[PDB]
Design a protein around this ligand. Sequence first.
Ligand SMILES: [Zn+2]
Ligand SMILES: [Zn+2]
Ligand SMILES: [Zn+2]
Ligand SMILES: [Zn+2]
Ligand SMILES: [Zn+2]
Lengths: 90, 90
Amino acid sequence: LVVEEMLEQYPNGKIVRLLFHGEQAKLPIISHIVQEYQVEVSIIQGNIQQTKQGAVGSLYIQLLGEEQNILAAIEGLRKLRVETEVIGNE
Amino acid sequence: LVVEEMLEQYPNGKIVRLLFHGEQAKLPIISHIVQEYQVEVSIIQGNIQQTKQGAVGSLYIQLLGEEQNILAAIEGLRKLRVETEVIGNE
Ligand SMILES: [Zn+2]
Ligand SMILES: [Zn+2]
Ligand SMILES: [Zn+2]
Ligand SMILES: [Zn+2]
Ligand SMILES: [Zn+2]
């Protein structure tokens, strides 16, 4: 992997993996969540490609902010059809 | 797997996988979160064994309740040293 290297380098907040299969909400996802949930975003690693289905791939991001807001932003992503999970829970 | 079969049979709330490596908080975890976060718990699948390290294994549970409370219960588990993630995000 090794996802714990991301946790090691980016300790604060939560690190999440976002998946894009082309079904995600057609809006500016990252700015949308920044503004709505008052979270900061740092891109750690990613691979996204444009396909006929739309943007497809993965993004690992660090979210910073109040705990409740980070949690809400993560469920927000999921509801916007971006599968999201906090790394380090396997 | 197939974790989506759990989502199919238990549609409401969130389905989470909890991991126990023996480092988890030494308290009655499931009742603790039920009471603190006002969530309901249904066990879907699990394999837990007692070892010299303590209780080790996994539990898949359905959490029911208000969205914010479910989210808080999930982070609560993590803080209590039970690695937890919402299934269906791979
Ligand atoms: Zn997707
Ligand atoms: Zn929104
Ligand atoms: Zn996982
Ligand atoms: Zn553990
Ligand atoms: Zn507690």
